[PDB]
Amino acid sequence: LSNEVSTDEALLKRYRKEIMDLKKQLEEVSLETRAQAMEKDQLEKERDFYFGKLRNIELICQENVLQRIVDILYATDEGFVIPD
Amino acid sequence: LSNEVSTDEALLKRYRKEIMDLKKQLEEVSLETRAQAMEKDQLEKERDFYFGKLRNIELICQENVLQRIVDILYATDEGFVIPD
Incomplete structure (x- = not known):
């Protein structure tokens, strides 16, 4: 409990x-x-x-340099990876 | 100006x-x-x-199916495009 005794007008102003x-x-x-x-x-759209693009690139490599493009798609990049 | 006349205690309570x-x-x-x-x-990291991956895929296609992988990289996809 504060020992200050304020006026009602001063407390209303506060x-x-x-x-x-x-x-x-x-x-x-x-x-x-x-x-x-x-x-x-905007970050989500980007x-x-x-x-x-990665999804369409995977479809192109699936139907068939092209080899290691797939390895990049499923490579672990700094703590993140796309599962099977 | 309101025509209500409130007590100072009621206004403090309000x-x-x-x-x-x-x-x-x-x-x-x-x-x-x-x-x-x-x-x-999290969206930015993703x-x-x-x-x-797209950057490393571009480096792989640069040094050399492989053709239209480049077209996807620089294709307009729903209002967005990567410039030269």
């Missing part, structure tokens, strides 16, 4: 300022989340853009 | 509840932003994982 600051923060974080979501969608 | 709700919202949006940032990093 609460209005905290509410104002919290609303400003909430809208800023919400707008940043929207911008980060759009950059996340990922699917790249994978669409 | 302000404390709004501050409590705003702080809860701010922490929830902040935690969601952290989770979305981790999923965004994108770079895929591109690392």
Whole structure:
């Protein structure tokens, strides 16, 4: 329990300022989340853009230099690998 | 200007509840932003994982079925294309 004895007007003024600051923060974080979501969608489109080529390259090597192109498709690259 | 005449205690109680709700919202949006940032990093690693294969496949086709593998690398795929 604080030993400060504030007036009711001063505490109301403090609460209005905290509410104002919290609303400003909430809208800023919400707008940043929207911008980060759009950059996340762009990264996903680029990922699917790249994978669409690897998938078609695998189909070309399947029906038949061409050999080690397959090894790259299923190679472990820095902790990640495409399973069978 | 509202025609309501509230007591100072009732308005303080209302302000404390709004501050409590705003702080809860701010922490929830902040935690969601952290989770979305981790999923965004995973998408970026997967994108770079895929591109690392396309880059090495281009190097293999450069030094020399192999023909149309290059066409796929530089093909326009649903509004996106890798420039020269």
